[PDB]
Write a protein that binds this ligand. Structure first.
Ligand SMILES: [Ca+2]
Length: 449
């Protein structure tokens, strides 16, 4: 079956658009007016309330749109209860750091229906954005490379459809946890993939299988840069979904079935905080998350780490390959920014059993106390660990140490640290040394050496 409409052209259910193992049902997208895609423009001069615009030169000229600055589109997918302002508060953070035309793409009418119909309706939203990018190009001489499309969930595949219709001339697409059911494993034609824009960066936060783990995000790679914060399967601060061999996808998408959406929504929460924290999301190249947590992928590669989120386009080798892997951990609640450090402590004093905590003091602040090791504390040994600090301390000026003994022992054993070496994520190393040994619950300051 094939339908054709004015402005947007024809759409058919021919394979691969339908009737293949990943998306079996033959159904067509609704018509444009039933999807009712809307373009809600916020700018630095109108940051709180939008100006509704349409692909018409006079309407664009009458708005606050300005051809001398970049344009970022934000396209939604699943909207959970109480999350309906996420698109405009993502635009409101950008106005704090840059001048931008920020356009929220509302297609609530075309998404609030069965999941397989919404998957098809993504094609209409795609076609509509390409059509406005086209008008900006022909009427204002505004190059597609000045536009960035950000799409979350099912919306990241509408972003891909737009990029595909602009022949990949679009400057950047960010996929925030691209939805998996009806898309993973399909041809590039049907999903978000690196040929859709000049640079595509993807953030993975709910990648466990939909059947039966109910992870709505693809595990499959889809950008030049693929980020897996916290491993991409379980996000800190979020509830987990119970396993189900058969699942009710329409009830889930339509909000009538129970589904913990925390994991899937974290992708745009991290992107919103990245805007205001330009170095708070360093991604490390690493072959896997287990190597990362085994402390095998620190410090950053010499040309710098990519920042996951808003600043990933500053990364020097961003298009040297597709599917480049980066891992990192985030906080469990907002500000989600974390800064990783590696600490090596050499213990002096007696043998004991307990845990050793360390705190960093620099010119920009000091951190919490983190546990480096728990177990038998052998003198002369070195114990190392990497932790994600919620404070960036700056240039280190001192470090502090404390230990706790996990037994009843009134000998009063003393334990100290002869050297503590701190490495930042740029590879800079600071050494601190001590002559002292101390009883438990006593804080030892170490000066540089
Ligand atoms: Ca594509």
């Amino acid at each position: 079956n094939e339908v054709c409409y004015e402005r947007l052209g024809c759409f058919s259910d021919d394979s691969p658009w339908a009737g293949i193992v990943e998306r079996p049902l033959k159904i067509l997208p609704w018509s444009p007016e039933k999807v009712n895609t809307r373009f809600l423009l916020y700018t630095n001069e109108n940051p709180d309330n939008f100006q509704e615009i349409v692909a018409d030169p006079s309407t664009i000229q009458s708005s606050n749109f300005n051809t001398g600055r970049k344009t970022r589109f934000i396209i939604h997918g699943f909207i959970d209860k109480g999350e309906e302002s996420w698109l405009s508060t993502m635009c409101q953070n950008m106005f704090k750091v840059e001048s931008v035309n920020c356009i929220c793409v509302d297609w609530k009418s075309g998404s609030r229906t069965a999941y397989s119909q919404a998957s098809q309706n993504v094609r209409i939203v795609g076609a509509e954005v390409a059509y406005l990018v086209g008008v900006l190009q022909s009427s204002f001489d505004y190059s597609p490379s000045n536009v960035h499309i950000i799409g979350h969930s099912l919306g990241s595949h509408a972003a891909g459809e737009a990029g595909r219709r602009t022949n990949g001339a679009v400057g950047r697409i960010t996929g925030l946890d691209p939805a998996e059911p009806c898309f993973q494993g399909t041809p590039e034609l049907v999903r978000l993939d690196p040929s859709d824009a000049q640079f595509v960066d993807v953030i993975h936060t709910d990648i466990a299988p939909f059947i039966p783990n109910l992870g709505f995000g693809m595990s499959q790679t889809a950008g030049h840069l693929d980020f897996f914060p916290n491993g991409g399967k379980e996000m800190p601060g979020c509830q987990k979904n119970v396993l189900s061999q058969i699942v009710d996808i329409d009830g889930i998408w339509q909000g009538t079935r129970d589904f913990a959406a925390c994991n899937h929504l974290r992708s745009y929460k991290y992107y919103t905080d990245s805007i205001l924290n330009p170095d708070g999301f360093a991604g490390f190249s690493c072959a896997s998350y287990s190597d990362f947590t085994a402390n095998k992928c620190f410090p950053c590669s010499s040309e710098g780490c990519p920042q996951m989120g808003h600043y990933a386009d500053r990364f020097p080798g961003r298009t040297k390959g597709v599917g480049q892997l980066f891992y990192l951990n985030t906080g469990d609640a907002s500000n989600f920014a974390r800064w990783r450090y590696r600490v090596d402590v050499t213990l002096s004093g007696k043998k004991v059993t307990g845990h050793v905590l360390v705190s960093l003091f620099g010119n920009k602040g000091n951190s919490r106390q983190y546990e480096i090791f728990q177990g038998t504390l052998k003198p002369d040994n070195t114990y190392s660990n990497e932790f994600d600090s919620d404070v960036e301390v700056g240039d280190l000026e001192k470090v502090k140490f404390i230990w706790y003994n996990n037994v009843i022992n009134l000998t009063l054993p003393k334990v100290g640290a002869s050297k503590i070496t701190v490495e930042r994520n740029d590879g800079s190393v600071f050494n601190f040394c001590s002559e002292e040994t101390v009883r438990e619950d006593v804080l030892l300051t170490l000066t540089a050496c």
